[PDB]
Write a protein that binds this DNA or RNA. Structure first.
Ligand SMILES: Nc1ncnc2c1ncn2[C@@H]1O[C@H](COP(=O)(O)OP(=O)(O)O)[C@@H](O)[C@H]1O
Ligand SMILES: Nc1ncnc2c1ncn2[C@@H]1O[C@H](COP(=O)(O)OP(=O)(O)O)[C@@H](O)[C@H]1O
Ligand SMILES: [Mg+2]
Ligand SMILES: [Mg+2]
Ligand SMILES: [Zn+2]
Ligand SMILES: [Zn+2]
Ligand SMILES: [Zn+2]
Ligand SMILES: [Zn+2]
Ligand SMILES: [Zn+2]
Ligand SMILES: [Zn+2]
Lengths: 186, 590, 396, 590
RNA sequence: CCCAUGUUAAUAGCUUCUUAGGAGAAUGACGUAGCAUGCUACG
RNA sequence: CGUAGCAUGCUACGUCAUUCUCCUAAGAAGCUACCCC
């Protein structure tokens, strides 16, 4: 704006016109300097409007560039997090029995609903009340999915460990119900 | 994608895209770099190209930002801002880019093609970030030069293992050795699938190639092999961690009275316990590697990673450890490929063990105690950055000798490298002196060490041995073959095979000739165990048969000859070609 | 390809009239990001066409309810309004009708994609909506069927299912008549051709399908919002049995939806000057606006008070922050002004007086906290009934 | 940021920024404060500065609001409103700011520099909010005075633990003791990183500093240590919770027939159960701390937090509890730093236990039952506010004696503090009398308690003991050293080391001299367990060796001498310097 | 001349508010073409 | 009477400022339908 020479031309037109008015210059010279003041004001105003629109455009584009940089920086973070989750879930895979059943399959395609059922090392039974607990995992060992499981832990709703000797019919109401019982494959 | 400038470490989002390695640059640094060199392509979060589809103008000196895109002057929108302006180039964090006056070194590093010795000495006297960037772009240039090799189309299949090949004319044929791999292609007008990874060896007789493939597909005439290139990944860790002296030994627990032979090294063990990192320089065969073994013994409560640049060097380190260190804490990690023969006596590929041995490139990302880098002269700043990025540790020892032969640096061809610019650690050794220093040869007899004290080593050795009269010289020339630019001397091999009987104690001698093709040839005619000079330098043998093939710049370098001869534990017969080199040492005449 | 897709099940947190927990199924972005792309053109053409049977996207404001209720009475003979309600609609819907909905909603792609592309889109919809893996509180179960309430095409798929049940009830009612009692000789011929086109004819019969669909839109004019239906069925035809009464819908829901729609929750209005009893949970009444009579939708006048007194977030208790919330509630509850009962009618004046008191105490606090009143205060129209009355006028 | 005025508790958003502690102020109060004192900087939600960039005028008496910013008269906009106007200063909630006439006390508190006794007595007779504000700004002034200490640059490293230092001239050198910490800096023209936190001790011989560092970095010549200051955080809770008498005992369940020795204290236990808070004043060694132990026994169903200002005081409380209370419910919480030696016999750092012992500053934010504050005289209103902010409880007991030595108050140097202005609780004790009072010494023999009844205590003690003939006096002067303005008397230490044998029963005696440097010196020459007088006052010993170093204002205060002598369970030898103080007590002559 | 201390979905509708762009209108300043009137020089 | 020049007034077009209206995009906050009776 003020850095442009059009502002300087406006300033010198103003100076010349003010000097002519102070000196009481003739009407023809005063009209010529009024024309100079007008054309300087118009040119400088055009320059100022163009400069303002230029600054608006530049700070719109830098805003867009900040937004795109943030987007491309979030994409890389999500890709890294997704690869981390996939490789950790790979690390948890029980690569002996799972590989055995896959190499035992027809084309190597086993339905997903039997991938845990034959390879999962941990079995979380969830039991809503004592009447079911008597008929599903009574004792320290029970049979489910044609394999023998042994109780390792029994927790209640608020995750406070309950020993297996406290699950009795008379002691049933005092327990915090459904009991997540975690067992291991044997 | 934002980051830090590789010249002033300011926040920025520009990348000078004309560079092969594509480094970040601050705004002021990017302007000073694109104003001077021919680098005229800047990548912001989206590339600076004329977004008008009917244009191809990429130079950042004339591109104008309009709306939300960029245009040349011809497609300039009514409202537009010039990018290259008032000493800067428009980009993110424009107001906080502190400029730097070090743009000349960065221009010279990113512009030069790594051919003359000036580029390398510029790559070792610059700042830390410039050190890393120069090493990374040097590795990238090596990879791209590897990419420019020819394509090997077969002509016929000689046997199930023997193949007859022909390389495409117009591009130089890569030499045949175990390092270079190829991917095969089967063109049947469709289905150009990778048929396997093949490693090639020159045959015993005739223009024949013995191939070893990952796959077992039968080769046909139409299959052609193309060399594979490895994408060099960027590095972050500094070349040297900042030294921080400690008042007392930390992270270590010394053991009283470890042994009697390690008596003179106790003070140096305490010094290594003191400093954060330390350097040990000594003449060859002076216990530098065995010092690291005694260092492991002196601090038995330290999970030590021995790592080395070479392969047989780390294997010899494993052998020395098995000689001294208790076996059942040592492991030797080999890579997944492992196309070269490793040392199979420790529990292979056991990262969790206490005494872990590895090559630099195969190091696993781990925490550790004191880590010993072996043969620093063989390694470049890429290797030091890798070992300092993958192994986070509480003590670093760097052992090696500047007088030995350095890394190959295949790009370098004109001029010779001074020792002190081999890498950062060798510069440390030749600037302020080694932190520990021990020179007296416990390896070689008196005559060989006397000759090597008349050689490049200005006479300083005081070796504790006597003349065993087991050092022999020859002079005859021999014939050159120039197989793949790796010469083979058949009559010299024939004379060695002739000798071979008159002194039966040399039937267990080990063959030494750099010349990998001649090294492979020696495995057939006489069948002695053999080793090239570069994969040597860290092992030793009782009897050594050294054969100088050609009077070239390669096998007449004084460092290479010295490191070839000084592996002789009890004796060496060297058959020489150069009159001056043969006359410069004092063995028997023959 | 096929992309199996976990969908989480969360518990909705919103005001409701009964204590059973409500669950909404959040479908993973891998399925939404393609279902939107495959279905968006149709799902925007349906929600931008006014005056059709699937009235989704006809605004109930701006005299839009009266246009709905006049495009229902599409010149039927002796109208009676009927409304049904599928019990457990989004859980007991058989898998076959969900496949039917996803086919009729994907018949438009006769040109853009090939056949196998359409089939793999059908398999992806039936693996990411119909029979998927439901993550229900830290555990993957298998959902045996029934549409999830959270995919891209939920309300429109339910609309297609609802029209399917309506037409199926009509087909059953037209077939199951005695046949010799159907005196209207055109209708008896229609039944005699309906049986042939159903069972004794393997390929389509577009002449007869067009004739029967014209019959349905002449004597069974319908209005659908995803399961909320209003039917304007001719009374004489229902009494003779040539059109689906309520009992036909009870039978159709019995043998096709596997539930029992007890007749205590499907209404029938024998008059028309009172409108449908309950459509879209907003009752309908006939008011005199300007010079003429228009229908107005008014909500259950207790739900508005329940939305006022209870707020799901504690910052909404403050009142003076939320005037732009009581404005919306008053807009929704304005038609209670003209209700003949008075205790209903007082709710709108309660909200008006409360907005006025809220703004009085807001300017009190913004005159104490700062020292100067607000400069351009434009809340002088929210406590005037003229704004809300303009909100239900046919101009815009 | 809005809040409440610290003078009238009206809603406001002004903060008189010239104050070091930056308190809130209502509009009328802010005008009355900036019109009188030199406080001419007011912080609203944005600071009252001339927002014209070419100006620096901050005084609120002349600043005019225009548009949305503030300007001076020179950059005044055409439309502007004067801020300081018609008795108020413009700010939020202008119409509801009720003025207050208490602005004189607030001016005097926030203006005075905490040097004369007038400021302290103004800090204890004001309102509650003024009490809190005065204590907080006093702590802030102490911290800023701590910040004005010199920088210690080393000259050479004597040993791995011994260092030779030099303090920067022009700022006074801080004294060397365990409380003061330093942060080290390594200036190598770059990378000014905190190299560690170091605590310094004066050496046994010579101008030497023994350093103990968190880090193990080896010190070099260029490293310099700078004292660290703690940012004093604002407090909210009142100094004293409002008393509310109860008709019957609540939150407690008394136990019949607890013991026989606690018989006379049962009524006081019931009184503590009655009131919300209570105060117990007694002469030293009259069971005041042991009363709290019997109080714990009398209500065994009460989760009791014992807290104390000192460290060895709470340790002696722990020891007394272990003597009487059952052990396995008591814990002793030490801070994370814990640079001073604590008492390690209970389960350390167990907040969840029933009988929790702690220092005031290390208290955890918790609910509790009856909480006993020990040695209230040692604590200031900051401590009472802290203990009343972190521990929410149903009964409060404050036990301690106004006659003992108070908190140090290093800022105070001119004039002497009357006892009744020590803090709020001591003012309560000396205004209306203690809630419980017990005077009869169960600690000291007859002669020492007789002397202390001839001392500051106007004769009231009726101790139940007889003259054990174990009280001894000396008179000789000794030599002063003035190490760090903490004097050391080497010949007095030598005479004590001389004595030491003629009466072997004093080889387990405990050394008492305030004089922390002399206390550290005593640990070397004779090796007796030692304790300064301030970290005393709550413990007791069978034989006490007390050494008066210098006839200064510090170690001749009657309170300090009384609290030093009255720790003698069976006997004390005091070597005196002042003729008048030595003659004022009746021990043996020697 | 110095001594205490660190804890919760999809779709749809609607109300309000902000920003950006476009279009149109109105008023005024300023500038270039066209029309008219008047003054001067020449024919 | 005409040409050239000057002055004044009146129309057409361009630049700027202000106001108003409409739309399109983007964003933020909220409500209802949904869910159950
Ligand atoms: N003090 C010693 N006593 C006995 N043998 C030694 C001693 N020092 C070194 N040696 C021998 O010298 C050899 C030097 O080996 P090494 O350190 O591998 O040499 P380089 O470092 O040159 O490769 C070792 O094999 C070791 O047996
Ligand atoms: N009734 C009593 N019977 C026996 N000993 C008592 C009795 N009262 C007090 N004592 C003894 O007097 C000492 C006073 O200790 P303490 O309360 O710590 O004194 P102070 O409060 O002055 O520090 C206790 O050690 C205790 O053994
Ligand atoms: Mg070696
Ligand atoms: Mg006590
Ligand atoms: Zn570049
Ligand atoms: Zn830079
Ligand atoms: Zn272009
Ligand atoms: Zn102030
Ligand atoms: Zn006030
Ligand atoms: Zn100013």
């Amino acid at each position: 704006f003020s850095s442009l020479p059009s502002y300087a031309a406006f300033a010198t037109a103003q100076e010349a016109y003010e000097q002519a008015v102070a000196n009481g210059d003739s009407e023809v010279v005063l009209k010529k300097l009024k024309k100079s003041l007008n054309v300087a004001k118009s040119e400088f105003d055009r320059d100022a409007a163009m400069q303002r629109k230029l600054e608006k455009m530049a700070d719109q584009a830098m805003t867009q560039m900040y937004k795109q940089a943030r987007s491309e920086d979030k994409r890389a973070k999500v890709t890294s997090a997704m690869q981390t989750m996939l490789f950790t879930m790979l690390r948890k895979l029980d690569n002996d029995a799972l590989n055995n059943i896959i190499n035992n399959a027809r084309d190597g395609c086993v339905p997903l609903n039997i991938i845990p059922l034959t390879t999962a090392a941990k079995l979380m039974v969830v039991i809503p009340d004592y009447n079911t607990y008597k008929n599903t995992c009574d004792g320290t060992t029970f049979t489910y999915a044609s394999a023998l499981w042994e109780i390792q832990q029994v927790v209640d709703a608020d995750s406070k460990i309950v020993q297996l000797s406290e699950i009795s019919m008379d002691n049933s109401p005092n327990l915090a119900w459904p009991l997540i019982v975690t067992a291991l494959r044997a | 994608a934002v980051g830090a400038c590789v010249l002033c470490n300011s926040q920025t989002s520009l990348r000078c895209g004309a560079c092969i390695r594509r480094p970040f640059l601050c705004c002021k640094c990017c302007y000073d770099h694109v104003i001077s060199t021919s680098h005229k392509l800047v990548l912001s979060v989206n590339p600076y190209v004329c977004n008008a589809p009917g244009c191809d103008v990429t130079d950042v000196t004339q591109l104008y930002l309009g709306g939300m895109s960029y245009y040349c002057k011809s497609h300039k929108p009514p409202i537009s801002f010039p990018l290259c302006a008032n000493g800067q180039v428009f980009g993110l964090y424009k107001n906080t880019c502190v400029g730097s006056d070090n743009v000349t070194d960065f221009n010279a590093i990113a512009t030069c093609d790594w051919t003359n010795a000036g580029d390398y000495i510029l790559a070792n006297t610059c700042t830390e970030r410039l050190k890393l960037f120069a090493a990374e772009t040097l590795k990238a240039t090596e990879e791209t030069f590897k990419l420019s090799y020819g394509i090997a189309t077969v002509r016929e299949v000689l046997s199930d293992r023997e193949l007859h090949l022909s390389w495409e004319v117009g591009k130089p044929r890569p030499p045949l050795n175990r390092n270079y791999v190829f991917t095969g292609y089967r063109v049947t007008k469709n289905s150009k699938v990778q048929i396997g990874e093949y490693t090639f060896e020159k045959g015993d007789y005739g223009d024949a190639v013995v191939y070893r493939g990952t796959t077992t597909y039968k080769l046909n005439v139409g299959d052609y092999f193309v060399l594979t290139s490895h994408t060099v990944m960027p590095l972050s860790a500094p070349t040297l961690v900042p030294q921080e002296h400690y008042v007392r030994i930390t992270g270590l627990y010394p053991t009283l009275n470890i042994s009697d032979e390690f008596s003179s090294n106790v003070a140096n063990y305490q010094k290594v316990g003191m400093q954060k990192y330390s350097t040990l320089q000594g003449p060859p065969g002076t216990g530098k590697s065995h010092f690291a073994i005694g260092l492991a013994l002196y601090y038995p409560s330290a999970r030590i990673v021995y790592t080395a640049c070479s392969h047989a060097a780390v294997d010899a380190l494993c052998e020395k450890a098995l000689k001294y260190l208790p076996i059942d804490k040592c492991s030797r990690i080999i890579p997944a490929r492992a196309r070269v023969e490793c040392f199979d006596k420790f529990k292979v590929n056991s990262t969790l063990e206490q005494y872990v041995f590895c090559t630099v490139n195969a190091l696993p990302e781990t925490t550790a105690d004191i880590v010993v880098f072996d043969e620093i002269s063989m390694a470049t700043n890429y290797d030091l950055s890798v070992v300092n990025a993958r192994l986070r540790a509480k003590h670093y020892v760097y052992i090696g000798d500047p007088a030995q032969l350095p890394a190959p640096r295949t790009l370098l061809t004109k001029g010779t490298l001074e020792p002190e610019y081999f890498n950062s650690v060798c510069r440390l050794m030749k600037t302020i002196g080694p932190d520990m220093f021990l020179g007296t040869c416990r390896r070689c007899p008196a005559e060989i060490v006397d000759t090597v004290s008349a050689l490049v080593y200005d006479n300083k050795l005081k070796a504790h041995k006597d003349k065993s009269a087991q050092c022999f010289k020859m002079f005859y020339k021999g014939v050159i073959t120039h197989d793949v630019s790796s010469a083979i001397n058949r009559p010299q091999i024939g004379v060695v095979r002739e000798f071979l009987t008159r002194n039966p104690a040399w039937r267990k001698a080990v063959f030494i000739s750099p010349y990998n093709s001649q090294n492979a040839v020696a495995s057939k005619i006489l069948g002695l165990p053999t080793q090239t000079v570069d994969s040597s330098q860290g092992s030793e043998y009782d009897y050594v048969i050294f054969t100088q093939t050609t009077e070239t710049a390669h096998s007449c370098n004084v460092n290479r000859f010295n490191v070839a001869i000084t592996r002789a534990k009890v004796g060496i017969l060297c058959i020489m070609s150069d009159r001056d080199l043969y006359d410069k040492l004092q063995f028997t005449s023959l | 390809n096929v992309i199996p897709t976990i969908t989480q099940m969360n518990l909705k947190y919103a005001i409701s009239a009964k204590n059973r927990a409500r669950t909404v199924a959040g479908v993973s972005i891998c399925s939404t990001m393609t279902n939107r792309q495959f279905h968006q053109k149709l799902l925007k053409s349906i929600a931008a066409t006014r005056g059709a049977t699937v009235v989704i996207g006809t605004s109930k404001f701006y005299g839009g309810w009266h246009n709905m209720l006049k495009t229902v009475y599409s010149d039927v003979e002796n109208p009676h309004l009927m409304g049904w309600d599928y019990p457990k609609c989004d859980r007991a819907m058989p898998n076959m009708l969900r496949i039917m909905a996803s086919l009729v909603l994907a018949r438009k792609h006769t040109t853009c994609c090939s056949l196998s592309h359409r089939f793999y889109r059908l398999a992806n919809e039936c693996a990411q909506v119909l029979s998927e893996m439901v993550m229900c509180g830290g555990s993957l179960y298998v959902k045996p069927g029934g549409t999830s309430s959270g995919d891209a095409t939920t309300a429109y798929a339910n609309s297609v299912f609802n029209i399917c049940q309506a037409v199926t009830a009509n087909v059953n009612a037209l077939l199951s008549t005695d046949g010799n009692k159907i005196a209207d000789k055109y209708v008896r011929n229609l039944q005699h051709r309906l049986y042939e086109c159903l069972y004794r004819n393997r390929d389509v019969d577009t002449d007869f399908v067009n004739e029967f669909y014209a019959y349905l839109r002449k004597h069974f004019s319908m209005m659908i919002l995803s399961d909320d239906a209003v039917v304007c069925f001719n009374s004489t035809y229902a009494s003779q049995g040539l059109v689906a009464s309520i009992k036909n819908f009870k039978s159709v829901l019995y043998y096709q939806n596997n539930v029992f729609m007890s007749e205590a929750k499907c209404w029938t209005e024998t008059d028309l000057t009172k409108g449908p009893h309950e459509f879209c949970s907003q009752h309908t009444m006939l008011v005199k606006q300007g010079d003429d009579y228009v229908y107005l939708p008014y909500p259950d006048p207790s739900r508005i008070l329940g939305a006022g007194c209870f707020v799901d977030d504690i910052v909404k208790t403050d009142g003076t922050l939320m005037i732009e919330r009581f404005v919306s509630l008053a807009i929704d509850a304005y038609p209670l002004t003209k209700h003949p009962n008075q205790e209903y009618a007082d709710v709108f004046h309660l909200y008006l007086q409360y907005i006025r008191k809220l703004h009085d105490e807001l300017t009190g606090h913004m005159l104490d906290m700062y020292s100067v009143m607000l400069t351009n205060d434009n809340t002088s129209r929210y406590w005037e009934p003229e704004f809300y009355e303009a909100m239900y006028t046919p101009h815009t």
